[PDB]
Every structure is written in structure tokens, then in C-alpha cells.
């Protein structure tokens, strides 16, 4: 019936506190222990650092 969104994906790197456009930037780049997804966070993110939310699975961390 209706296609799923889920089953398809982007390569739309945005900042994990906000979303500035750092899309293939110098960002913050690490993998997550959870998933292992390429999650890319911004210099401003580096005081966010304390507390962290991957975007990717959800998974709240700090």
C-alpha cells in the first residue's frame, strides 16, 4: 500500500544539538557505540558535549 520512508535513507549530516549544515564538514565525527552510525556534531556542540543525543537511534547520552 503506502511505501515506507524508514526504508529508505539520506545523507543529511546535521549537528545533533540543533543542525547547523556541517555536511561533510570538519565537524565532530565519532561512531556510536549503539549503532555505529557517522554522527557529526558542530563546533558550538563541543558545550553541548555535557549532554549528547544520538540522532540516529535515539539513544540519550552525556
Known amino acids: 500500500g503506502a511505501m515506507g ?4 535513507q539520506r545523507h543529511a549530516h546535521q549537528c545533533v544539538s540543533c543542525g547547523i ?5 570538519s565537524a565532530a565525527t ?7 552510525q557517522e ?3 558542530c563546533s558550538k556542540c ?17
Open 21 to 25: 549544515n556541517i555536511a561533510g564538514m
Open 46 to 62: 563541543r558545550k553541548q558535549s555535557n549532554l549528547y543525543e544520538c540522532p540516529d537511534c535515539g539513544f540519550m547520552g552525556p
Open 5 to 8: 520512508s524508514e526504508s529508505e
Open 39 to 41: 554522527i557529526s556534531r
Open 30 to 36: 565519532f561512531k556510536c557505540p549503539d549503532c555505529g
